[PDB]
């Protein structure tokens, strides 16, 4: 009754607390998933950006060199 | 007659922002709520 | 006394362990906040970068085309 | 005689992707497994 | 025997559950480490990118201005 | 008389690094410390 209800005290708490812990674990899992998704999207964005930039600098380089060569010749004649 | 340069348009490349504030806040709350999951053995 | 202290064993542990768990939850929350802040700052940085780059490529494109047209005409006369 | 422009090659700059799916999934599992760590006091 | 095994019920669960919680904590720690590593690598990548881009725009600017000045003079004579 | 090109200066754009090592390490420690929160029922 007294020390039989002392074993019923432990049980009500441990049960309720496990309910809180289970919730904390799924919340943590959800937060980690949301971070993984954005981290990876932004990685992709950056890599796409580098591709396009590397293309554009190739073109710019080539055109600048051509212009410089053309202008050299036009100034030398 | 020189062709146009035609650089690629990069203005559609976008980085996303994350929103996990709900989760962060909830973790702090669950921590505070484990106070009344503590035993008083009497 | 013996099995009355057996219910006092359970309580000392469960209390101390909940103290550890509570700490683990706030530590996890802090870590997630620090990651959210940096992820978002770096997103912002990237988006600002794209803005400025898109501006600069517009200007570069325009100037290159003008130069090419000008040089064409100067070479054709 | 104008020297070549010589821009820097940026094509080796790479962003990495993260893989924490194993961990995310495992957290959900451990949460479900704490069901049979619950007491039935009878 | 009955309420002495009621204190042996609590112990088997609490032990097994702490084993699950300990695992959840190290799993969370591992996930956070993997996110920190990628976040920081990608920060580095972005900063390297900005360095190289700032170099390249300096050069491009300088060359464009020189070309424009040269072409101005060649058109004015 | 052609105006200067005047490109925008991007050199102030900076990505930040995160430091959660304290937290990561502490999680591993709290996990190890839950060993002496285990019961020996005798």
Question: What CATH number does residue D27 fall under?
Answer: 1.20.5.790
Q: Does domain E1-77 have CATH number 2.60.40.10?
A: no
- Residue C39 half-sphere exposure toward CB, CA atoms < 13 A: 29
CB contact under 8 A, F10 and C31: no
User: H or E stretch including E21?
Assistant: helix E6-76
Burial status of residue F33 (CB atoms within 10 A of its CB: 0-12, 13-18, 19 or more): middle
D24 SS3 class: helix
User: What range defines the domain where residue B21 resides?
Assistant: 1-42
Query: How do the domains of chain C map onto residue ranges?
Result: 1-77
How far is Cα C34 from Cα C74, in angstroms, rounded to an integer? 59
Give me the residue label for tokens 């950056």.
A46
Å from E61 to nearest chain F CA?
6
Q: Going by C-beta distance under 8 Å and a sequence separation of 6 or more, which residues neighbour residue E8? A: F41
F8 SS3 class: coil
Contact C55, F8 (CB under 8 A): yes
**Relative orientation angle of helices C6-76 and E6-76, to the nearest 10 degrees:** 10
How far is Cα A63 from Cα A53, in angstroms, rounded to an integer? 15
How far is Cα C64 from Cα E64, in angstroms, rounded to an integer? 8
DSSP string, C11-74: HHHHHHHHHHHHHHHHHHHHHHHHHHHHHHHHHHHHHHHHHHHHHHHHHHHHHHHHHHHHHHHH
Contacts of D20 in chain E (CB under 8 A): 30-31, 34-35
> Phi and psi for C32 in degrees, rounded to 5?
-65, -40
Q: Going by C-beta distance under 8 Å and a sequence separation of 6 or more, which residues neighbour residue E50? A: C49, F10, F11, F13, F14
Å from A62 to nearest chain D CA?
9
DSSP state of C4: S
How far is Cα A8 from Cα A12, in angstroms, rounded to an integer? 6
Domains contained in chain F, number: 1
How far is Cα C42 from Cα C60, in angstroms, rounded to an integer? 26
CA-based R_g, chain E, Å: 33
DSSP state of B12: T
Most distant CA pair in chain B: distance in Å? 96
Burial status of residue C75 (CB atoms within 10 A of its CB: 0-12, 13-18, 19 or more): exposed
Structure tokens at A50: 């580098």
CB contact under 8 A, C68 and A71: no
> Phi and psi for A58 in degrees, rounded to 5?
-60, -50
């Amino acid at each position: 009754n007294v020390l039989y209800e002392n074993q019923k005290q432990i049980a009500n708490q441990f049960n309720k607390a496990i309910s809180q812990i289970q919730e904390s674990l799924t919340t943590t899992s959800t937060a980690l998933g949301k971070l993984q998704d954005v981290v990876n999207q932004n990685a992709q964005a950056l890599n796409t950006l580098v591709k396009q930039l590397s293309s554009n600098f190739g073109a710019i380089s080539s055109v600048l060199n051509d212009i410089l060569s053309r202008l050299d010749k036009v100034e030398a004649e | 007659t020189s062709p146009d340069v035609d650089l690629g348009d990069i203005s559609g490349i976008n980085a996303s922002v994350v929103n996990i504030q709900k989760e962060i806040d909830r973790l702090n709350e669950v921590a505070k709520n484990l106070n009344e999951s503590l035993i008083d053995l009497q």
